[PDB]
């Protein structure tokens, strides 16, 4: 169940809901070192930029980024994902 | 013609292919200030956010949008968005 597979629609939400700095620790919490996370930030929209990277990996499962959004304390986002 | 209406999925187009430094310049044209702009790196997608803000105006049309960028030199963003 892919992350890339995702609707544009729901994908756009997901970027909406990861406002701010959230998307650095959603990388951190994903394998990303800081240097490479601020290697996102040349990019006109880091955090496309870090998920479309991050889901070119088979893992990359809707699922798998739920878990990473569980572990890096926000829950209120994936609850809100799923409501 | 409002920017805005425009169908998520162009919406995408015309951010991806204003890559790197792109929106900043684009910006710049469309009469945000450089700490203004400046301002729009603190969201997860700061294309898309100042885009956003400047597609809330009713002159923010893409006809106005493409004038912006032929006087940025970006002519090739024109064609590449209009073929
Ligand atoms: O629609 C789904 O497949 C979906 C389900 C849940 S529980 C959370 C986020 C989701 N999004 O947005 O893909
Ligand atoms: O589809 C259109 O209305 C469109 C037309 C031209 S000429 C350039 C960009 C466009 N986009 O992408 O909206």
Redesign the interface.
Same mark, same amino acid.
């Given at each position: 169940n892919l992350y890339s597979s995702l609707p @544009?629609?729901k994908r %756009?939400e997901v %970027?909406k809901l @990861?406002?701010?700095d959230?998307?650095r620790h959603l990388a951190g919490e994903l394998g990303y070192q800081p240097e490479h996370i601020d290697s996102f930030?040349? %990019?006109?929209?880091?955090?496309?930029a870090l998920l479309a990277s991050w889901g070119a990996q088979d893992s990359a499962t809707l699922d798998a980024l739920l878990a990473a959004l569980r572990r890096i304390q926000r829950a209120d986002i994936v609850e809100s994902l799923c409501s």
């Open positions: @544009l629609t %756009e %970027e @990861l406002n701010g959230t998307w930030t040349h %990019e006109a929209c880091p955090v496309r």
